[PDB]
């Protein structure tokens, strides 16, 4: 019974967790495709906190040096 | 604004694609054409060659 409720518990938490992500996951897609949807060659889309954008789009512009489109 | 990265992208497809598309069916026309070309510069070879062996029979 103590094995049982301690497998039982790290499985749950081990569902609980990955469900959770991938519905946060999710989520941030559909908000990703939203914006995404407006828009060899190569792109990315993503998701960042918005306090970060200045320092962001500054390192972007210094490592592909002065040439990224992004919004 | 965006219109112009939109016809960016839609463009930079299409140029790779058809550029490269264009090229490779150029590639095959040019060995087929080396194969045929190859030969009727064989055939004129021999021919001479014929022509020659004709002037001492």
Same mark, same amino acid.
């Given at each position: 019974?103590? !094995?049982?409720?301690? &497998?039982?518990?790290? @499985?749950? &938490?081990?569902?609980? %967790?990955?469900?959770?992500? &991938?519905?946060?996951?999710?989520? !941030?897609? =559909?908000? $990703?495709?939203?914006?995404? +949807?407006?828009?060899?060659? #190569?792109?990315?889309? #993503?998701? $960042?906190?918005?306090?970060? $954008?200045?320092?962001? %789009?500054?390192?972007?512009?210094?490592?592909?040096? #002065?040439?990224?489109?992004?919004? | 604004?965006?219109? *112009? #990265?939109? +016809?960016? /992208?839609?463009?930079? @497809?299409?140029?790779?694609?058809?550029?490269?598309?264009?090229?490779? =069916?150029?590639? &095959?026309?040019? /060995?087929? *054409?080396?194969?045929?070309?190859? +030969?009727? @510069?064989? %055939? *004129?070879?021999?021919?001479?060659? @014929?022509? %020659?062996? =004709?002037?001492? !029979?």
């Amino acid at each position: 019974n103590f !094995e049982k409720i301690e &497998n039982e518990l790290k @499985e749950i &938490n081990t569902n609980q %967790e990955a469900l959770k992500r &991938n519905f946060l996951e999710l989520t !941030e897609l =559909k908000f $990703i495709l939203r914006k995404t +949807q407006q828009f060899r060659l #190569g792109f990315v889309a #993503g998701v $960042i906190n918005r306090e970060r $954008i200045p320092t962001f %789009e500054r390192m972007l512009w210094r490592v592909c040096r #002065g040439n990224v489109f992004l919004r | 604004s965006q219109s *112009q #990265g939109i +016809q960016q /992208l839609l463009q930079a @497809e299409k140029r790779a694609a058809e550029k490269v598309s264009e090229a490779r =069916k150029r590639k &095959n026309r040019r /060995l087929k *054409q080396a194969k045929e070309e190859a +030969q009727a @510069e064989i %055939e *004129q070879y021999r021919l001479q060659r @014929e022509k %020659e062996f =004709k002037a001492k !029979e």
